[PDB]
Design a protein around this ligand. Structure first.
Ligand SMILES: CCNC(=O)Cc1ccc(Nc2nc(-c3c(F)cccc3F)nc3c2C(=O)N=C3)cc1
Length: 282
């Protein structure tokens, strides 16, 4: 589907993804005001050719992906201004779990439903032979109080086992990513582990992974932030058990954070486990 630039009316900026801005538009060809609300992702204007090929990549991936827990592609817009296309997606007014959970007291049962729905979307992603490479609470969007959608695919890549990585969300990344720059399907499950930690802290800034890891590492030697983080993880140190997180849910987090990638469960493994744990608490 092709949106006509001349019927896009901007309302507000929504945020910054990996290649450029997400803005809320009304698409109102009738001119009455009852037209659809749409989220439009655009390439930054002065972006160089490493970003542009990246952006063409993000466009290609979202156009192929169809799942109840991935953000709906609607179409593209001819952006004369940036001599490229704008990605047109469904609008989700509640935004990310990073924005939502700090203002809404959510129950444990509802957080594990979110966790389950994230695993179902990633299993789909993995079955289509893509890696996300930025699975974090900022990238998980809330459609409604019982329904999340993986929302941003700017770092996502087609696997021809693993893709060789070249900015980076290091505080969400497995030891093999940091040390060997190799991103495996199992590296996304590490990231899921940190996302699950984020949900159980209600994305409290002061309990965030950057904050918690730099508390362990310090900032007196900023140049070796990845080295010290790598050494800390290989020593087996981990983000703490969130307040009021059940012991077995923390065991599941630590399992997603196995140093050995091959010892981590797949998203396929996690779906039946998260269902059963959800139903226990609900
Ligand atoms: C300043 C106004 N802001 C808000 O009231 C909070 C808010 C922010 C953003 C949204 N929506 C969205 N946010 C992303 C998004 C992302 F997934 C990752 C990084 C940055 C982003 F903006 N993506 C999409 C949508 C959306 O509706 N459709 C796709 C909804 C509410």
């Amino acid at each position: 589907t092709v949106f006509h630039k001349r019927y896009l009316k901007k309302i507000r900026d929504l945020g910054e993804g990996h290649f450029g801005k997400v803005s809320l538009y009304c698409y109102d060809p009738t001119n009455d005001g009852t037209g659809e609300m749409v989220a439009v992702k655009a390439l930054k204007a002065d972006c160089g050719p490493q970003h542009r090929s990246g952006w063409k990549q993000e466009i290609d991936i979202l156009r192929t992906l169809y799942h109840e827990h991935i953000i709906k592609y609607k179409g593209c817009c001819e952006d004369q201004g940036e001599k490229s296309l704008q990605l047109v997606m469904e609008y989700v007014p509640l935004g990310s779990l990073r924005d939502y959970l700090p203002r809404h007291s959510i129950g444990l049962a509802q957080l594990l439903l979110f966790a389950q729905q994230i695993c179902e979307g990633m299993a789909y992603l993995h079955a289509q032979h893509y890696i996300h490479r930025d699975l974090a609470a900022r990238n998980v969007l809330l459609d409604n109080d019982r329904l999340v959608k993986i929302g941003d695919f700017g770092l996502a890549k087609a696997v021809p086992e693993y893709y060789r990585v070249r900015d980076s969300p290091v505080f969400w990344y497995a030891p093999e990513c940091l040390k060997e720059y190799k991103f495996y399907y199992a590296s996304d499950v590490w990231s899921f582990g940190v996302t699950l930690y984020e949900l159980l802290t209600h994305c409290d800034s002061s309990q965030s992974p950057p904050t918690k890891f730099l508390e362990l590492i310090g900032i007196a030697q900023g140049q070796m932030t990845v080295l010290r983080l790598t050494e800390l993880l290989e020593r087996g140190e981990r983000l703490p058990r969130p307040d009021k997180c059940p012991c077995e849910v923390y065991h599941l987090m630590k399992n997603c954070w196995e140093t050995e990638a091959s010892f981590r469960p797949t998203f396929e493994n996690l779906i039946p486990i998260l269902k059963t744990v959800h139903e226990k608490y609900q």
